[PDB]
Design a protein around this ligand. Structure first.
Ligand SMILES: Nc1ncnc2c1ncn2[C@@H]1O[C@H](COP(=O)(O)OP(=O)(O)O)[C@@H](O)[C@H]1O
Ligand SMILES: Nc1ncnc2c1ncn2[C@@H]1O[C@H](COP(=O)(O)OP(=O)(O)O)[C@@H](O)[C@H]1O
Ligand SMILES: Nc1ccn([C@@H]2O[C@H](CO)[C@@H](O)[C@H]2O)c(=O)n1
Ligand SMILES: Nc1ccn([C@@H]2O[C@H](CO)[C@@H](O)[C@H]2O)c(=O)n1
Lengths: 238, 238
């Protein structure tokens, strides 16, 4: 539908350079997928060669082993998230000049490695190797142009996840109810810190030139799309 | 058919530890796929929980961009080969104790990065990052137990490739006839060196305990399977 994996030649008319890059950043079950699908379609309607990319597009077949056998599979599955995200950005955003609406940015993945390092599932030496590769990959990808900061409270995430799992609309990914609850909580705390770092990064760090937009994860989906569209519409190029 | 991506629990009866690991190592169009499919079935007939894995199982959707835009995609596509191979070994061979017959070993991939570094498509800093990750990943995978050294001459590889591409039985992966010819030749030279290194590694290096088996790539398929079976049959465990 969106031609995400085309190895053919660029086709951007006379426009040069990468497309523009919108990232929706926050913990699981915030409403990001819902927002991304609508936003990508709205940008296409405005004339942009835009695509919306949820991580489920590139989830590894071995995903569940990261959560059931983390000291064995957290390191390579985290490498997978990084690498598959990178390749989609390198091709769609950079090579082909398309506009990207993505679940998370390439800057979010390092926080998920930090969680496994803190728990002991990934070693410090493994993290150092990850970071070396991450730095080389990230150097080839432009910063996001708009980061939407939408971090849900843990009990909100878990309420939404429990309903979806119970209705069969999403798979159960964790080895126990407690493992799901605990990862959601540890990720929430790390996301609060990551977003505070992003706020400083955009002023005094390497994200100068990037716009940040705060969004309450408890807002209605229609309020979320209205709020994000009011900033994303400015980024449309034909 | 072979249940390669099962995230469920191990089921090896009373047998502990990894399965056994047979790798077929040599340049493209040697006859490895042909041999691997038959060998895996023969080992299953003998009572082993064996699988045969060709790289085409885990080829990235972006493979062709490694050869048409190498200074942009060689690094992440080489990371993909490494990582997807690693995950299949970590799950099937180690976690689940299955016996593996694989196209190449995890020790072969570094030579493909060396080719891109020599040409300039991968930078020295990119290669250093690759090697750091490669070392951490390889430390979790047992050495191959039997390495079959089967390196075809370049014109033999190219004859077989041209016939398959002409008949539509394999896709054209390269941006030109010359690019195909040149990569095949550079890989051939590097494989001659890699195999000489393996021969020394198995005596004075970290492959002590591993068996090597020489096989002429020009031999008939039935001679190849007879020759490899005569050594692989000894590795069967129930
Ligand atoms: N504002 C909301 N109110 C209630 N449920 C919601 C809301 N947004 C999403 N959900 C539900 O939560 C689950 C996950 O939503 P999703 O958009 O996929 O979140 P995310 O991508 O951030 O992980 C889905 O079942 C979805 O229908
Ligand atoms: N001994 C052989 N003689 C002639 N053609 C062969 C022989 N072995 C393989 N081929 C052909 O060469 C092509 C590639 O063979 P394949 O087994 O897939 O090689 P590899 O896995 O080493 O790359 C196939 O079209 C195959 O039919
Ligand atoms: N680099 C990343 C990105 C995401 N995730 C987690 O993967 C799960 C997908 O349902 C979600 O629980 C999400 O939090 C992850 O573990 N590591
Ligand atoms: N780590 C690796 C392993 C394999 N290859 C090449 O991929 C092609 C697959 O048809 C073959 O040409 C094969 O040589 C590769 O480029 N890099």
């Amino acid at each position: 539908e969106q031609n995400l994996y085309d190895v053919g030649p660029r086709d951007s008319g006379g426009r040069e350079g990468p497309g523009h890059y919108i990232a929706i950043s926050g913990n699981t079950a915030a409403g990001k997928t819902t927002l991304i699908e609508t936003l990508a379609g709205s940008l296409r309607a405005a004339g942009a060669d835009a695509v919306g990319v949820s991580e489920r597009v590139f989830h590894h077949r071995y995903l569940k082993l990261m959560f059931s056998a983390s000291a064995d599979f957290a390191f390579p599955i985290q490498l997978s998230f990084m690498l598959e995200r990178h390749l989609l950005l390198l091709d769609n955003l950079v090579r082909r000049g398309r506009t990207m609406v993505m679940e998370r940015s390439h800057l979010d993945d390092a926080m998920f490695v930090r969680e496994h390092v803190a728990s002991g599932a990934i070693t410090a030496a493994q993290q150092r190797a990850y970071t070396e590769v991450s730095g080389e990959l990230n150097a080839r990808i432009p910063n996001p142009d708009l980061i939407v900061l939408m971090n849900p409270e843990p009990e909100l995430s878990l309420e939404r996840l429990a309903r979806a799992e119970a209705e069969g609309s999403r798979p159960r990914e964790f080895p126990s109810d407690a493992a799901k609850r605990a990862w959601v909580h540890r990720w929430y705390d790390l996301y609060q810190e990551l977003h505070d770092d992003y706020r400083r990064r955009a002023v005094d760090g390497d994200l100068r030139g990037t716009e940040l937009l705060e969004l309450d994860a408890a807002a209605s989906p229609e309020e979320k799309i209205a709020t994000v569209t009011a900033r994303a519409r400015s980024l449309v190029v034909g």
